[PDB]
């Protein structure tokens, strides 16, 4: 995505509009809880298997532990993925906050445009023409700045998502 | 020991309830993610997180099937060694 | 020798050569496949690299020591404004009636970029002194519209007072019957008539100005050379090198070269033939 395809009125307005990160912050809390509860589940599952082994030692239960091994491992991998989700959501919220902060405010763009129109309104004798071009260079600098702010935002979000790997289906037991 | 298998089945279903319950409790929060702004980066993030929550829910449903069948197996195991005395 | 690309094709050259901005008068997009295979057939991109000669030219525009700019128009020059409601924000379009010419030099290498319509044309150009620059401009202007120098005498008026007076005069359509404030500053009856025509209903306009780059800064020419063709003559407005004074002049070949020299002598960092 090349957001320099678009003028700064577009990139700046788009980042300032919308509801904010509250709903991402709430989801992060929710993912934390799951991490907590599923770790407890894992820990309870290990204890259940071990106390079954302690209560009835011998070949039948050992074969039961063997047939549970894939699911025990899967459960461990699940918990490791769970503990990464909160982190990365907060990394994304930060990325959004820095994009919001670093983007050029609209007022600054509108002022550039309004100033430029006043010079033109008064340019019968042509003596503001170079100042008019300085303002166009300034506008182009806003376009450039927003372009690179959106580039860095894309790359931060992209890196964060790349660390949230896909859920694998649990293996069976017996 | 037959009784040990029965005890384990109960504990495995209790663990299943907990997995099912935690999934459900927070599902409204994981799936309600909105883009924080109107840009396409924000939207790609929110859309990913919603889909990621949905796939996590399929996954726990699958793991609750796997646990229930374990519990059923332990029970049926216990009724064989108890009905052999 | 010369090359002609549109605004998107120009953006590809920017990407291929990692050039961020060029002159804002060219109205391209900053830089932060099927369109390629067109420039391969025209020999601009050999293998997957920009031709050595064309790369060089584009690098002049990428970082000039000097830009000398000419905005030309057929009819009233609009300074890039298109009146159309559905025009998008930061449109790269230019009005149908405008030709933009940027003359850039890096070291001793003078390059030209001319934007007309959606087409930017790039080529080497021969520039030595203010005369040759005046020539290039007059050639460009004559091509749009032929006119003779107005029948008036050169006069110098205070810049501030002339702007204030020209702003009232504008409110009445630059009518010669409302030219009394300009008459009282000692401007000729003939000049006031010719200037009123040039401002109220021009057949062609030209603004010439320049920009100079030093280490960590830039700066525009303090003066702008402006030419206008109305009923009864081409006239030349430009600021003297200093508050300020506007020269109002018949657009003779001589006074036009004087005006270009004044533009160039009002750059902030001095000598412009040799600067770096």
Give the CATH number for residue B51.
1.10.287.850
H helix count then E strand count, chain B: 2, 0
- At residue C166, the 3 state secondary structure works out as helix
Q: Choose among A76, A104, A68, A84: nearest CA to A32.
A: A84
d(CA C164, CA C160): 6
Altogether, the residues listed in chain C come to a count of 276
Q: Which of B27, B45, B63, B71 to mutate to test the interface with A (most CBs of A within 10 A)?
A: B45
Q: Where are the domains positioned within chain C?
A: 1-276
Q: Beta C204-214 vs C119-124: how paired, if at all? A: unpaired
Task: Measure Cα distances from C76 to A7, A124, B62, C227 in Å.
Answer: 27, 10, 74, 11
Contact A130 C25 (CB under 8 A): no
The Cβ of residue A76 has, within 10 Å, a number of other Cβ atoms equal to 12
**C110 strand-pairing partners:** C105
Q: A38, B63: Cβ pair inside 8 Å? A: no
Report the interhelical angle of A129-162 vs A106-121 (nearest 10°): 160
Separation of alpha carbons C100 and C94, rounded Å: 9
Instruction: Please give the angle made by the CA atoms of C198, C102 and C26, to the nearest 5 degrees.
Output: 95
Structure tokens at A118: 């006043």
In order of start, what are the domains of chain A with their CATH numbers?
Answer: 1-174 (1.20.1260.20)
SS3 readout for C187-254 = CCHHHHHHHHHHHHCCCEEEEEEEEEEECCEEEECCCCEEEEEECCEEEEEEECCCCCEEEEEECCHH
Task: For residue C237, give the chain A residue with the closest CA.
Answer: A125
Cα C171 to Cα A138, C165, C232: the distances in Å are 31, 10, 22
Inter-chain residue contact B53 with A26, CB threshold 8 Å:
no
Structurally, chain B folds into a number of domains equal to 1
Distance, in Å, from the CA atom of A125 to the CA atom of A117, rounded to the nearest integer, reads 15
Question: How many Å apart are CA C71 and CA C100, to the nearest integer?
Answer: 5
Which site among B41, B43, B50, B61 would you substitute to test the A interface, given the most A Cβ atoms closer than 10 Å to its Cβ? B41
CB proximity list for B63: less than 8 A, separation 6 or greater: A75, A78, A170, B19
Give the distance from residue A148's alpha carbon to the nearest chain B alpha carbon, in angstroms: 13
| Structure-solving method | X-ray
DSSP state of B25: H
Q: Which domain holds residue B47?
A: 1-85
- Cα separation, B16 vs B11, in Å, equals 9
- Report how far residue B43's alpha carbon sits from residue B58's, in angstroms, rounded to the nearest whole number: 23
- Classified as helix, coil or strand, C130 is helix
Residue B11 touches partner A, C-beta closer than 8 Å: yes
Distance from CA of A120 to the nearest CA of B (A): 33
- C-alpha distances in Å from residue C115, one per residue of C5, C54, C98: 10, 17, 9
Interface residues of C toward A, Cβ cutoff 8 Å, are 20-21, 24-25, 29-32, 69, 71, 79-81, 88-90, 159, 162-163, 166-167, 170, 199, 205, 207, 209-211, 220-221, 223-226, 237, 239, 246
């Amino acid at each position: 995505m090349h957001f320099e395809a678009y003028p700064p009125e577009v990139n700046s307005a788009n980042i300032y509009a919308g509801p904010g990160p509250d709903s991402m912050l709430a989801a992060a809390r929710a993912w934390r809880s799951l991490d907590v509860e599923m770790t407890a589940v894992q820990r309870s599952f290990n204890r259940t298997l071990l106390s079954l082994m302690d209560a009835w030692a011998g070949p039948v239960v050992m074969q039961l532990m063997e047939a549970a091994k894939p699911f025990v491992r899967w459960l461990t991998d699940l918990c490791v993925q769970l503990s990464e989700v909160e982190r990365q959501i907060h990394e994304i919220v930060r990325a959004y906050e820095w994009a919001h902060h670093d983007m050029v405010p609209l007022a600054q763009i509108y002022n550039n445009r309004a100033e430029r129109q006043i010079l033109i309104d008064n340019n019968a004798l042509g003596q503001f023409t170079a100042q008019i071009a300085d303002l166009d260079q300034e506008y182009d600098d806003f376009w450039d700045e927003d372009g690179e702010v959106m580039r860095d935002y894309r790359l931060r979000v992209s890196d964060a998502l790349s660390k949230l790997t896909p859920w694998k289906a649990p293996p069976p037991i017996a | 020991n037959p009784e040990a298998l029965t005890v384990a089945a109960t504990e495995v279903r209790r663990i299943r309830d907990r997995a099912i319950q935690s999934d459900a409790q927070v599902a409204p929060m994981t799936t309600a993610v909105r883009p924080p702004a109107a840009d396409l980066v924000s939207e790609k993030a929110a859309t990913f997180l919603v889909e990621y929550a949905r796939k996590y829910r399929q996954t726990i449903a699958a793991a609750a099937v796997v646990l229930e069948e374990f519990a059923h197996a332990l029970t049926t195991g216990a009724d064989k060694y108890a009905t052999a005395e | 020798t010369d090359i002609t690309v549109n605004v998107d094709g120009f953006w590809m050259l920017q990407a291929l050569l990692d050039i961020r901005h060029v002159a804002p008068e060219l109205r391209c997009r900053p830089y932060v496949h099927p369109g390629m295979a067109v420039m391969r057939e025209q020999g601009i991109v050999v293998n997957d690299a920009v031709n050595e000669q064309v790369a060089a030219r584009m690098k002049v525009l990428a970082a000039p020591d000097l830009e000398v700019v000419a905005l030309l128009s057929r009819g009233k020059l609009l300074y890039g404004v298109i009146d159309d409601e559905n025009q998008p924000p930061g449109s790269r379009d230019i009005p149908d009636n405008e030709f933009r010419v940027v003359l850039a030099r890096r070291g001793q290498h003078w390059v030209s970029a001319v934007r007309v319509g959606n087409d930017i044309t790039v080529d080497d150009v021969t520039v030595s002194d203010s005369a040759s620059i005046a020539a290039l401009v007059m050639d460009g202007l004559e091509s749009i519209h032929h006119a003779d120098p107005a029948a008036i005498n050169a006069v110098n008026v205070p810049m501030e007072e002339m702007l204030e007076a020209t702003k009232s005069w504008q409110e009445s359509g630059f009518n010669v019957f409302s030219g009394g404030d300009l008459r009282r500053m000692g401007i000729s009856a003939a000049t006031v008539a010719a200037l009123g025509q040039a401002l109220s209903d021009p057949a062609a306009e030209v603004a010439v100005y320049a920009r100079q780059y030093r280490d960590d800064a830039k700066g525009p020419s303090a003066s702008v050379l402006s030419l206008k063709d109305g009923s009864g003559g081409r006239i030349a407005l430009y600021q003297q090198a200093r508050e300020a004074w506007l020269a109002i002049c018949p657009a003779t070949p001589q006074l036009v070269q004087v005006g270009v020299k004044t533009v160039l002598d009002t750059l902030p960092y001095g000598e412009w033939k040799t600067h770096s």
